[PDB]
Write a protein that binds this ligand. Structure first.
Ligand SMILES: CCCC[C@@H](CN[C@@H](CCCC)C(=O)N[C@@H](CCC(N)=O)C(=O)N[C@@H](CCCNC(N)=[NH2+])C(N)=O)NC(=O)[C@@H](NC(=O)[C@@H](NC(C)=O)[C@@H](C)O)[C@@H](C)CC
Lengths: 99, 99
């Protein structure tokens, strides 16, 4: 599909069996998901943006379906105000910017 | 252009007569640029990101050329980690996400 930018580009994702809403963020290197009990092993990480840094848990090789398109990669879990799909997964679904 | 996301979507912009580099950011409502002088007078605002909140100066009706495409709109100036072009100006240049 084509997604315009008049409103926030929020889409449905499927991760760890759950459906959630997430923002497609070309300005995010990584994918950051709100809380979420999730699997069994992780590494600590800190990530920053406007503001400052938050602490997150890095999980690897997590399947994430984005608007029906399958992806699999690293997901960071922590107290983000909005679920964010970043470039690591946008590239896997063939997402481009066009103007 | 069509821009893929294997690298950060950094482009050159012209603002106030000056060249800068900025990130095309579908996850940003607003356009936020590092501390600089802009003609005109400004109002204080606060904006948020992953993380927390920062204080910025809001300038309205600022011409900005983004990879050669013209926009005229709001520019927030302050201590952002990265210059970002947000949806307020991305919509003006007709930028969409596609996959
Ligand atoms: C400044 C750093 C680069 C741009 C920024 C854009 N992220 C969005 C995320 C959405 C909120 C969590 C953002 O900050 N958006 C702000 C930008 C400011 C603005 N005024 O537009 C925004 O829209 N803020 C709205 C509110 C958010 C609404 N979003 C939503 N409902 N989904 C506002 N008016 O305050 N990217 C990031 O924050 C990511 N940072 C990065 O990718 C890199 N970090 C740095 C410091 O460059 C990397 C080295 O880690 C985070 C997610 C880690 C992967």
């Amino acid at each position: 599909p084509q997604i315009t930018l008049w409103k926030r580009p929020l889409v449905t994702i499927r991760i760890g069996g759950q459906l959630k809403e997430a923002l497609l963020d070309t300005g995010a290197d990584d994918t950051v998901i709100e809380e979420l009990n999730l699997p069994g092993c992780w590494k600590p990480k800190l990530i920053g943006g406007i503001x400052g840094f938050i602490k997150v848990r890095q999980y690897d090789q997590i399947p994430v379906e984005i608007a029906g398109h399958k992806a699999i990669g690293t997901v960071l879990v922590g107290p983000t105000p909005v679920n964010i799909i970043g470039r690591n997964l946008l590239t896997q679904i063939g997402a481009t910017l066009n103007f």
